[PDB]
Each structure stands twice: as structure tokens, then as C-alpha cells.
């Protein structure tokens, strides 16, 4: 299915760079005038303009002991304040070189399946001035009571992270074992002497290993085209998995490069006269689900975290028997 920004918008991770997009208009959040160093009391506006290389369009959510629920302009380090210093009806959002306070708190929230910018501990949300679902370029953003779907924002990741590790939460780590039983053709010796007979089985489709990372909305982070992580696909022993997807994916597919079992079976069986045999392959499959924490690093080595669900199918043991028919 196609990425649907209204149902799939991720909640931003604090300390990571984001672009902010007004979903209904597709316009981005800019400082008015587009400077990398906006002046104090410069309004936040919506503008169709977009360039991934423009640091002036990057925003960072902050939530720490010194800055509780605040929003920072990346290129300037200025915070997003209500003009005049307290949230109220039609208070313009501005950048200002001063720390946030309780009466300036701003965060992205999920309400009825969409993400909005909200003044924490209030019913004031971020609206375009005039309330249009399709505001004109340079329309200022304001605080106003209540929300409606046309006010939704999408936080688009604006930097590339490294996936350092994924740690499974074993308290909810569930393994189901299933035997996959595969039979060759019947081979009969219709001669009057014992015959050594070549019997082959192809199991590629049956014994496909896989792993997936799943998210309720979407991964929401950029980590490059592929990344490798060790995952405990059966018991505690880590297996190398290569994942590839996009920040927009709700399921990131992983490849297991090293198979633990055989997918081509070639047996040489002595069949007595008049007798018929088959090769029987029994392959143990571990289907595993576990909540997990992804640990990612910024280029400067700041650690952030993302919850996921790890699902995997792994064929880990195999037996081959000659069975009579
Ligand atoms: C070319 C250029 O930087 N133009 C910018 C535009 O992209 C947008 O940021 C706007 C916000 O008020 O300020 C300027 O017009
Ligand atoms: C000291 C003080 O409260 N200053 C605030 C500043 O932090 C910011 O909120 C600004 C927005 O217009 O309003 C005032 O100047
Ligand atoms: C009825 C209506 O759409 N009213 C809107 C209001 O909800 C809010 O968006 C405001 C922001 O300036 O613009 C208009 O007044
Ligand atoms: Cl609406």
C-alpha cells in the first residue's frame, strides 16, 4: 500500500532533525524570509518551497530536564515561542533566542489517528492564521483552541542515522516451532539386483528465512538503503540480518544471508530388488515475535531510540531419512 501521510505520520524522536509539512496543503514550515539565522520574533510560516539541503527548514523536538516539550530551529538554535511569551488565542509562533517555559510548550501529538502540533497542558493547537485547509505562501502559524484534520503535520526525517543495535524484550519474546516435512518422488528398483539410486529434493521456496521490523504508523527514520543487525532468530544466538526499506515503510523486510540448513538435498540410496523408498526431509522452523528497542546514532554519535516489533522465520535444524513406501 502507498504511504498515506494522515494515517502513517510518525511521532518525531526528540533530538533528530525533521522537516515539518502541513499535510493538507503540502506546504512546509519555514521561518519567514527563509534565513538560516532568523531574527528574534520572526514568524513561522507555511511555504510551498522545499530543498532537502536547506538547514533553515530543519526543526528539532527537545524534551529534557532543561527544556521540557519545546521545539528548536536547527540552523539558528532558537526556540519556537508564542509571540509575547505566552500561548493564547491567535498568538503567532515565532523563533526566539531564549529557552522555552511551561507557557511555551509545543509537541507533536497523535489525536484520532493524525499528528498535530499542540501546546502541552492546553487545548491550543497550531493553526494557519485564517484557518484555510490550503493556506497561501507566507501564511503565519498561530495558536488557536481545538483541532480538526486539516491542521495535521507530518514530521519528515531530515538526517540519516546509523542503526547500532536492536535489543529484543525477552519478557514478550514468543517462539513457535513447526516441522516442515518434504518428500522426494517414490524410487522403485524394478531390477533383480540392489541398485544405488540418486534421489534429489529442491526446498528453496519451503525453507525461505525472513525477518521484518514492523511499526503501527511507519519507521519514521532515515538509515540509508540497507543496514545489518544481529538478531536472536532461535534462542539467544544472534544471526546477521540485512534490512532495506524507507522511513515511510510500516514493515522493513530483512534477508538472512547465511542459511543454517540445506535447500538442495542429494542422497545416494541402495534400494533392494522390488523395493520402493522416498527421502523424507524434516526441517525445524522457528517463527518468532518480540517487541524490541532500536538504538540509532546521529553522525556526531548522539544515541536515540525507536520501539519496533521483530518478526522472523528461521530454519535452524534439518534431518534426512530414507523411508519405505
Ligand atoms: C529563495 C528563497 O530562499 N526563498 C525563501 C522561500 O523559500 C521561503 O523560505 C520564504 C519564507 O518566507 O522566504 C524566502 O522567500
Ligand atoms: C524573558 C521573556 O519571557 N521573554 C520572552 C521570550 O522568551 C519569548 O517568549 C518572546 C516571544 O515574543 O517573548 C518574550 O520576549
Ligand atoms: C470557522 C473557522 O474555520 N475558523 C478558523 C479557526 O478555527 C482558526 O483556524 C483560525 C486561525 O486563525 O482561523 C479561522 O478563524
Ligand atoms: Cl478539517
Author numbering: 3 to 327
Paper text:
TrefLec was searched for original domain combinations, which led to single out SaroL-1 in the choanoflagellate Salpingoeca rosetta, that contains both β-trefoil and aerolysin-like pore-forming domains. Recombinant SaroL-1 is shown to bind galactose and derivatives, with a stronger affinity for cancer-related α-galactosylated epitopes such as the glycosphingolipid Gb3, when embedded in giant unilamellar vesicles or cell membranes. SaroL-1 is composed of two domains, a β-trefoil domain at the N-terminal region shown in blue and an elongated domain (green) consisting of seven β-strands forming a twisted β-sheet. The lectin-binding step is necessary for the pore-formation since the pre-incubation with a high affinity galactose derivative diminishes or abolishes hemolysis, GUVs penetration, and cytotoxicity.
Several crystals were obtained, those of the complex SaroL-1/GalNAc and SaroL-1/Gb3 trisaccharide showed suitable diffraction and datasets were collected at 1.7 Å and 1.8 Å, respectively. The overall structure of SaroL-1/GalNAc consists of two monomers in the asymmetric unit. They are highly similar (RMSD = 0.52 Å) and do not present extensive contact, confirming the monomeric state of the lectin in solution. Clear electron density for three GalNAc monosaccharides is observed in the lectin domain, corresponding to the three sites α, β and γ, classically observed in the β-trefoil structure. In all sites, both α- and β-anomers of the GalNAc monosaccharides are present, with stronger occupancy for the α anomer. The axial O4 of αGalNAc establishes hydrogen bonds with the side chain of conserved His and Arg residues in all sites. This Arg also interacts with the O3 hydroxyl establishing fork-like contacts with two adjacent oxygens of the sugar ring. The O6 hydroxyl is hydrogen-bonded to the main chain of a conserved Gly residue and to the side chain oxygen of a more variable Asn/Asp/Glu residue. Moreover, each GalNAc is stabilized in the binding pocket by a C-π-stacking interaction between its hydrophobic face and the aromatic ring of His (site α and β) or Tyr (site γ). The N-acetyl group of GalNAc establishes mostly water-mediated contacts, confirming that it is not crucial for affinity.
